[PDB]
Design a protein around this ligand. Structure first.
Ligand SMILES: C[C@H](NC(=O)[C@@H](CO)NS(=O)(=O)Cc1ccccc1)C(=O)NCc1ccc(NC(=N)N)cc1
Length: 247
């Protein structure tokens, strides 16, 4: 997250931190995610496409820091890793960048609710916030494009939704952005999501209710003028979400 402020998991209780186990013994951070139900975390496919081995992943809930433990945190294994079959990456655009992770503790249980672990609501069919609406994003991603390290403390910021028409302009992203995607940015281009924030939530207040409106997917650079962050439009993948989370 470029700009914004440091926050704690108590303020983003649905945020899930996903790590990858390595050949040696070390564990590195992969992407963000959101808990949509006790047993399901939603993220982005580009995070796992190169290593689709579910056993290499660890999911942490209730965690405020990257490389250290937080009181009340819970560790989970990945029971099932569901990637979207029509995922593809072009010059800039990442299509159908959405993934589902079924989690389970070593005891074979799903997440238990607490002050630091809560679920986030999914949107209604084709019901997205009006453009110009302020939404929040959370992540452990880079604070600056020139950084090679991620921040140790969770961060958050507020961005505004941009219309498909404006984002489709020549100086923005042109025809690369589709209706299955949502653009969001800071009107002053000072705050934005960046590398490492992938898979994280774009949360918007829809009729007094906190809703998972998007998933951090892609963008040209970070915090650059006329180059908004692009998010996977969650409301369009509800049928896909429902069909894969049943049984
Ligand atoms: C895998 C994906 N790739 C890209 O977004 C590529 C185009 O496919 N663009 S990029 O190389 O400019 C991303 C980037 C930005 C800064 C440093 C390293 C990489 C990605 O990095 N997603 C996370 C990500 C999401 C949004 C942004 N940009 C933004 N909010 N303006 C920056 C990064």
């Amino acid at each position: 997250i470029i700009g914004g402020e440091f926050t704690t998991i108590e303020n983003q209780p649905w945020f899930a931190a996903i790590y990858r186990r390595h050949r040696g013994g070390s564990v590195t951070y992969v992407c963000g995610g959101s808990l949509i139900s006790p047993c399901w975390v939603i993220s982005a496919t580009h995070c796992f496409i190169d290593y689709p081995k579910k056993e290499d992943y660890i999911v942490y809930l209730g965690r405020s820091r990257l490389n250290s433990n937080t009181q009340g945190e819970m560790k989970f294994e990945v029971e099932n890793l569901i990637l979207h079959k029509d995922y593809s990456a072009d010059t800039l655009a990442h299509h159908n960048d959405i993934a589902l992770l079924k989690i389970r503790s070593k005891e074979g249980r799903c997440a238990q609710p607490s002050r630091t672990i809560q679920t986030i609501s999914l949107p209604s069919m084709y019901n997205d916030p009006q453009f110009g609406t302020s939404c929040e994003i959370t992540g452990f991603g880079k604070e600056n494009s020139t950084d090679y390290l991620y921040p140790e403390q969770l961060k958050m910021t507020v961005v505004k939704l941009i219309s498909h028409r404006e984002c489709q302009q020549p100086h923005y992203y042109g025809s690369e952005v589709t209706t299955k995607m949502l653009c969001a940015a800071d009107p002053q281009w000072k705050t934005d999501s960046c590398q490492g924030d992938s898979g994280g939530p774009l949360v918007c207040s829809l009729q007094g209710r906190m809703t998972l409106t998007g998933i951090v997917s892609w963008g040209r650079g970070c915090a650059l003028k006329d180059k908004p962050g692009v998010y996977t439009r969650v409301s369009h993948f509800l049928p896909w979400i429902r069909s894969h989370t049943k049984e």
